[PDB]
Amino acid sequence: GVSAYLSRPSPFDLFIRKSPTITCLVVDLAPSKGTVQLTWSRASGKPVQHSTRKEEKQRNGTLTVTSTLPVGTRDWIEGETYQCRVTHPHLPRALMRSTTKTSGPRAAPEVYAFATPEWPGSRDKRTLACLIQNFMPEDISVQWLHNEVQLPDARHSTTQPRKTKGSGFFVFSRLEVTRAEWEQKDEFICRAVHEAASPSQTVQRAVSVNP
């Protein structure tokens, strides 16, 4: 019961923060004593940067171990293939996952931010929703901003990119806000960071609790 998953960089880290990373997550349902050992390699044969390892015991007796490798901004965008080798002790052969930039057509996202009306027995709080659609590839970064500062990632919840009736993708983001927040400044921004978004890989729409 050993599955491995290899993630691409987030568009926020790649284009804005300019410091992309890739994570290799290995979910182990029978934790036997020893070491899992996540090794990294590039398809070119060039050397890899130092990765950060983290092992976590879950609330159901399963070991979750991740290795985060920092990649090159220009190396990722230009098409380098990064690989991950997982040498598990309860497996005769090695687990190998690879990650590279999704090469194909582009479509910039369409941002739409909405605010829910006052529901009986919910005066001091409102829900702000956002529909980010018709984009390709599926890799997108959804952020919420208030007072020109980025709200913590835990405050909101974005859905996984699903396909539209056409060729693009879509995500929905939910953000519950307090009365104190909208009374301070009644303007909340939904930021989408995406490969195709022109200019500077960012699209944004502002919303108001009661315009």
Partner: protein
């Protein structure tokens, strides 16, 4: 000062050295190949330079040092220079993405995907100088 000195395996033309690579390589792997050779992917800036390249260009297609950082939308040579001279083939530059640049057998330029594998690539470096007599 006369600039025409090149290292072994490199062909001269004006003030630059040229290496005509062979082997199946992606655009970025073609980029890494030139860095190992203490050069960089070819940057075409004159119709005289292109005329020379076309004569030594592989019929299959060659990778050239032109692409974009995405956070641009405009093509920029590996050395950092902008596009002054252009030998784009009819209907190019496209947007069937919305890319990396490759040179045809004819010498003409066309957009290609970053992951496409070509059997050739052209490298370039500044030619060294002979001091005056």
């Amino acid at each position: 000062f006369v600039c025409n000195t090149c290292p072994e395996k490199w062909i001269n033309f004006q003030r630059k050295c040229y290496y005509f690579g062979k082997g199946t390589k992606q655009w970025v792997h073609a980029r890494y190949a030139c860095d190992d050779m203490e050069g960089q992917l070819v940057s075409i800036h004159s119709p005289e330079e292109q005329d020379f390249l076309t004569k030594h260009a592989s019929h299959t297609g060659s990778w050239i040092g032109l692409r974009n950082l995405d956070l641009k939308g405009e093509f920029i040579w590996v050395d950092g220079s902008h596009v002054d001279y252009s030998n784009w083939a009819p209907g190019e530059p496209t947007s069937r993405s919305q890319d990396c640049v490759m040179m045809r057998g004819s010498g003409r330029w066309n957009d290609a995907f970053c992951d496409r594998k070509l059997g050739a690539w052209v490298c370039d470096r500044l030619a060294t100088c002979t001091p005056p007599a």
